[PDB]
Amino acid sequence: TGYDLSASTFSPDGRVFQVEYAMKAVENSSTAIGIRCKDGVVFGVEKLVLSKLYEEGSNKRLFNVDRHVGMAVAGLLADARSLADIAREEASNFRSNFGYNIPLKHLADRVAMYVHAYTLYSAVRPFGCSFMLGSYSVNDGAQLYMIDPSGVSYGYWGCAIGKARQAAKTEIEKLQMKEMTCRDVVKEVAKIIYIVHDEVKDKAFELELSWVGEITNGRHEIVPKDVREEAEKYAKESLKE
Amino acid sequence: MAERGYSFSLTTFSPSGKLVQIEYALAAVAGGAPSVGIKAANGVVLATEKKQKSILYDERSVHKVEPITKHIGLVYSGMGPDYRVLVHRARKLAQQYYLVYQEPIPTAQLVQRVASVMQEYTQSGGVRPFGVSLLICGWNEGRPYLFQSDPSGAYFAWKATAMGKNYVNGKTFLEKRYNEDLELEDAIHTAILTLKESFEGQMTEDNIEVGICNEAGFRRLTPTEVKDYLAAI
Amino acid sequence: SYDRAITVFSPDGHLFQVEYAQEAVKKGSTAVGVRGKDIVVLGVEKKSVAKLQDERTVRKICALDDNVCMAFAGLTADARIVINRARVECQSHRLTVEDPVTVEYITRYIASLKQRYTQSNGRRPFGISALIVGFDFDGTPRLYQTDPSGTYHAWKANAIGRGAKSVREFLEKNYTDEAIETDDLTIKLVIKALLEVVQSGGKNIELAVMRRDQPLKILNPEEIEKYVAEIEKEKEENEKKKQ
Amino acid sequence: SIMSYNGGAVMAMKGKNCVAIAADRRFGIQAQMVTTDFQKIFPMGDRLYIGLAGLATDVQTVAQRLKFRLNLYELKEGRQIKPYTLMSMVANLLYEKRFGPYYTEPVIAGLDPKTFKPFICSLDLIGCPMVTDDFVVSGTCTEQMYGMCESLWEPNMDPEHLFETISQAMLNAVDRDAVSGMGVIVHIIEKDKITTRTLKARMD
Amino acid sequence: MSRRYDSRTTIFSPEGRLYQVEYAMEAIGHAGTCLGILANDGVLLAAERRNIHKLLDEVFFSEKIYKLNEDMACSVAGITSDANVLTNELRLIAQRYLLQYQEPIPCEQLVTALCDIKQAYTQFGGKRPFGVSLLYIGWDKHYGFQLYQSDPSGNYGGWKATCIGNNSAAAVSMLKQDYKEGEMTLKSALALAIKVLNKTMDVSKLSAEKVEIATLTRENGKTVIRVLKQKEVEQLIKKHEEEEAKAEREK
Amino acid sequence: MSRGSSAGFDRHITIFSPEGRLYQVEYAFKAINQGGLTSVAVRGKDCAVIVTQKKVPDKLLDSSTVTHLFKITENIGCVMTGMTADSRSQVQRARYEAANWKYKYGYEIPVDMLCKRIADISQVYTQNAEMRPLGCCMILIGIDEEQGPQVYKCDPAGYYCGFKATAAGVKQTESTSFLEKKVKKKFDWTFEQTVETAITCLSTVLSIDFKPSEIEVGVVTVENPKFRILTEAEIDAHLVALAER
Amino acid sequence: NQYDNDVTVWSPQGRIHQIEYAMEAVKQGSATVGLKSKTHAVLVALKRAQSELAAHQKKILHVDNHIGISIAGLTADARLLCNFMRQECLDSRFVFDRPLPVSRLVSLIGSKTQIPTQRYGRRPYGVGLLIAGYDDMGPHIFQTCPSANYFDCRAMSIGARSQSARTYLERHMSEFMECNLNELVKHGLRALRETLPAEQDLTTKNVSIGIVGKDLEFTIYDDDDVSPFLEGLEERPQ
Amino acid sequence: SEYDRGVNTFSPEGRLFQVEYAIEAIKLGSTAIGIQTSEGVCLAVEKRITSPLMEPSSIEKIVEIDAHIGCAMSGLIADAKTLIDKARVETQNHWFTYNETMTVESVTQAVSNLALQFGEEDADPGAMSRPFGVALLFGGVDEKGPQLFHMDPSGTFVQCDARAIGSASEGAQSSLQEVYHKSMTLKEAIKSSLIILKQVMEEKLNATNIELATVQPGQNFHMFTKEELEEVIKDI
């Protein structure tokens, strides 16, 4: 009875409904997945093409937030872009102050606390996006973190966010990703994305792919065109039985 | 995130001319643990009950009778964390007074400054009034002082008073037991008896906290001294 | 730091806070200004006489400068704020410009202050209307009216406050060049206009007079009573001789 | 140099149950005398006085600001200020201007309210208090005043001996200073009365 | 957010009224009675003591009467802690004027400064108004002895005799009937105050511990402000009782 | 006024109800239970132990990052209960407060002082209307040189206290009654006995036999004041010892 | 309802209603079309006259020598945003002595317009923009929205009745890339004409054309410079 | 009732509520007419005097912004005061910086930039709390010739050949549409303005009920004296 209007108000059950409504905004966006293998992290996004008038790569949901750190988002894209700017600022300030690349766990904690700061006040609105941060280094290994609108940050071996995240998580569970390399994970990621897409509900989609690992010398980058085409062909073949 | 608080008052006048938020803070005070103050001829006693809700609580960890200076003591009835806020503010105000005048703050002056802070919270933007009543004791110019400060910011000077649960009956008991010329030991006995009137269950040296102010200053009674006094009763 | 919008537009195009400030004005005691040839006269009703009140402390007519004075209707404390601001403005104008203000200048300043309070965050409009009279350096008598909205106009004669509609009707039926030919006739016109709404027949009237080059003058009760007796004598003469 | 711009001399002295405070009366600018009745000793209570030497503008400013604060104190607390409390208040006022100091060196002479024990003190321009039991001096001829007071002061003087001692000290000290003098005013504070006198002095 | 929890303290009502000011005036009407009477040789305040309880410690100076500077004093009705705020502001204003001009502040100027503070709370800032009405008594070299009354709205006015607080309207009727302008002395003014307090405090009989009386007079070019002792008020009440008894015997 | 009375906005902002209650603070206390977990802290004669329930529903979640045990300094540990992001913000604040105390005063902050500081910070949320209180509870353990092991708990109301033993979360009432029974029959608690008491309290109120991956244990001892989290091997050794008895 | 007044209030469905209402503000405006070839970017704006005696409202604005915009929605918000974009372009030319790349400018716009969607007492910008630019990456058409989302487009139309224009652009998008400047402008004009009422036709009074290109700084054609582009247009197919 | 929504809330139709309400407020203003010809711009406003005791010369609904620019206002005149002061300051600033006269369009643009600078949060103290309730007609002569611009509280400004604002702006606008042709002379413009004002005014139209001003190439802003007003009105 009027308990769901501000993030500074608790419901009688102990819930903050504004944060839950932001989470609902995330649950309506399209699916992004991240998979952490033994030598890297691979991100795959199902980017829905709403208009054929759009260019390729418009409204991309994969970001480079640092040389070694990539970002996969779901939810309100403008919120996600502002959060990517926040993450870039955090990484750059860390390098300026402490003189080396920010560890992924520290960047995830900093951005998650920034996100949580928007769940306490009536003067602001919780972010309507969740995202994954992926990184690789020789010293720290491969790391994959996920942050939701409430500000909770967790490490994962595989993660899915968006409309079909439960089916995507089920598909991810069937993978022995701990011993796999980035090369075969990219195919597996493309297959999972093609599986969870609904052609009736959504007409067309581009498959955005990126990775970071020893394959890229610890640099997050878009997966090259050859590997992407091979992965798409393999996923399309797996769809047919 | 936005650090701007509300700038409008949360305590406003009702059509009948009352500030209902202050009356509700007083209701919170009236639901608090009983507190008693008695001003004897040579000192003041402040006695409160601290009956923990379990034996798992460490009695010695938290205190309800607090020193403000070497000569001023505090006790409260109401909401404990509000009390901690006011204790910190009172200590800072006493220190600022000492820094300006290089003498310990008179009890009445400190009471006035603390009451001013409480009034500020009755009028300023985006806050509720404090939900505590303070009993303040002090020794100044060879003289004992006992004051009560309410959540509105009004303060009164008392010879003996009670706050918290059953404080009307405590006041009746005090006014039919209190007399002038009383000594500090007899005032301690009377304060413990006033607590005993509203106490539920057995009163032990750990169930209650007692502070005394005399010429030597203000101090909390150790549980051994309280046990001696309880044995005398 | 309180930054609420208090005066906002209503769906019909109205500023309700300004209308409510005008309703606050309509509850004030009546004030009448008449602009004559050589004189400007202000007159204020006293809604009640407490018989124990120091009169000097509750005057509704005050001097903004040597050549400018004003009466008001509405909220007394808002009027005090506005009057003090106008006095500061008059002194600063005497400083930066080596001449006194025209009546229209200080009227413009007061009106713009009121308008600012109708369109700024965290404050309500002033609940007063003002009648400002005076003389310019040319010796021209000037009478102006400001309202809570911030609009101001010039008048030959005007009335504000409660019962101002009947007083304005009377002034429209009565104000004439012949009716302001002498100072006494102008004063009698002001008192007659006030008598259209006041009770007890002239004990509840405070009257002030400004003449060219002369400071503000306040009529003591003896002069007001003498003028009232003159007015009643003229009434009796007209009634008997014409009927 | 700045402290000597207007000249001036103030002195306080302790008696058995009494205090004395004396000041020169000249107001002048460098070598030129302007007036001969400039007030340097201000009452801060029934039995409490403060004398100010230094820049005349800062003498007046500090006296007025101290009166501000003292009036507020005595309204908030329904009592008269004690001399030690007044000294602390003056020191706080002076130290608030630690880097922009007032150019005055106050001297405080009084009796304890309700006790009537003599109190004298002096403060430097940034408010470092110095309580003594015999005498305090301030101004442009402190060396001469020290000679006179160290020679002439005795413990437990009755008010008449105290008046003679402080008078001779002030007169002979300011006779030997170019920019002080043109008359001396002495206040003797006892518990039951205050005596104000002007001394016959050289006017050159 | 702010908008839905904002009480809107400083806005007009549809009738042109300020509701918070009116409710503060209701609060004033609740509080203890204060009375002010001006005579030819002084002025007096007489306030009903609402802190009456046997366990209350004796008050230091006075419960409701505050000295403001060397020449002025005031009495308060309404919210007590708001009155503490206001009396501190008044003392500060008087000392600021003294610092600026090296003369005591005239009474009306002090009242006007405080009333400007009150009005500012009525117009902007979104805060609730002060729930205090004040009576001021003073002397200055311009107008001699003066009595003033100020409201939470910031309105003020000067009076020969006035009353605020509980039963103030009946007290004002008594004052209108009984006050004699230009002929009051402090003795007759004190007698009138005792009679008015007798009528206004209808439930509780006049005893010296239920009332506080302060007089402001001039002696040797100094202003003397004194709260009467308990025995003096007892004598005044005894004299009033004798007057009433003899007036009954005549009738 | 009447029981459970409400007037105005007392159910939405931290203002007093007619009975003098703050409903938003009570709702924050319910927000603690929204997390669904339970933690227990027990004080020994030479040690303090915190044992929290660890739940990882899915294998996709990196378990090493799912912790409610944190170290505030080298010598102070904490277990958080309730909303996870609120808990982590409070942990960050506690670490900052401890570091600043060491910097300003030149010695490590005592546990009671840190608990009191956090409690003051949260009382501020109970008194200001524009922000909600945090929906989390903090339990701190440490070793004071003068007084031995220390267990302190602070809650959303701003209330804090020292405990001989305490619990937080869903089943904290049952846990408190169990600990009351254990502390009434007072016997000298060694390190092993303290750990077993905490673990058996959690296992008996949750009505499940534990596994080394299902719980998290942190300890401070007088011999080794540094806060340390037991590995799964040490926890399994303790669990075996508890199961055989 | 209780969820549709503040931009900081999430609805129970995961939507923000004030943002959607600002989208409606954009949809109320008159149509405008933007398209690009390999070498040119063209904005064609259908201007509306309030009265018969009023000039048609300006729809195409200069931002920089290589960037221009066409606006739909609240004109004053569009002027705010245009001033911001001009200041960014001048900052880039001052600091780096190079023209600001178009996609970086669009990112700055998105960042600036996202902020008021999260802060209490703020509102979204009620303006949609078509941004035509040319830089090292060639020609660019961008679309910015009140939601602060932006799109890189082959072609786009916004404003009232823009769906018909979008259908025409869908049909001839394959042709656009190899068109010469006149043919590209004519494609844009036909798309804009598809949004017109039956009685109304494209005239030199209600058509404005902005062109940017490889060797062509951004140029606006309003009344008489439009006639060479209007000449040669076949009658509406119907 | 009026504090439920903030001042910067969009309606479901994409309009700011406060701007729409200010637009509605302008329909309560007196009628003003601007006509732009090749020989100059004419502006005419109904004064709408309420009482015989009011001095009509104290009503200023037409003001000089600069020697070459005049402004007619409708709606809430007190609101128009600050906008006009801003326009005067901007013209003088432009003269100070560039040693030339500001064009009518740039002055109108500068004034229109203020229309939507209102809000409650994220504002300096004393910032505008609501939109202005005025509609303005700027008539000027610049290098582009004589121009007439209309500005409304939404902040939209448009060039106009002829326009009416105020209470009777619809019927007056329809009359303007039949009367106005491009080659109209300034005398014909003035006569047609006065004819339409006479048609729509509730009172009879004399030399004291109206204000009329013209700006011409080579002649400064000129407010018609009452003798000139009677010269024009004598044959209507």
Author numbering:
A (entry chain G): 6 to 246
B (entry chain B): 1 to 233
C (entry chain D): 2 to 244
D (entry chain J): 2 to 205
E (entry chain C): 1 to 251
F (entry chain A): 1 to 245
G (entry chain F): 4 to 241
H (entry chain E): 6 to 241
What does the paper say about this structure?
The 20S proteasome (aka Core Particle) is a 28-subunit protease complex composed of four axially stacked heteroheptameric rings. The β1, β2, and β5 subunits of each inner ring harbor N-terminal threonine residues that line the central interior chamber of the cylinder and function as catalytic nucleophiles for peptide bond hydrolysis with, respectively, different substrate specificities. Substrate access to these structurally sequestered catalytic sites occurs via gated pores in the center of the α-subunit rings.
We determined the cryo-EM structure of a mammalian PI31–20S proteasome complex after incubating recombinant human PI31 (hPI31) with the purified latent bovine 20S proteasome featuring a predominately closed-gate conformation. Human and bovine PI31 have 91% sequence identity and function indistinguishably in inhibition assays The maps of PI31-free and PI31-bound proteasome were refined to the resolutions of 2.23 Å and 2.54 Å, respectively. We also examined the difference map between the PI31-bound and PI31-free EM maps and observed hPI31 densities in the 20S antechambers as well as in the catalytic chambers.
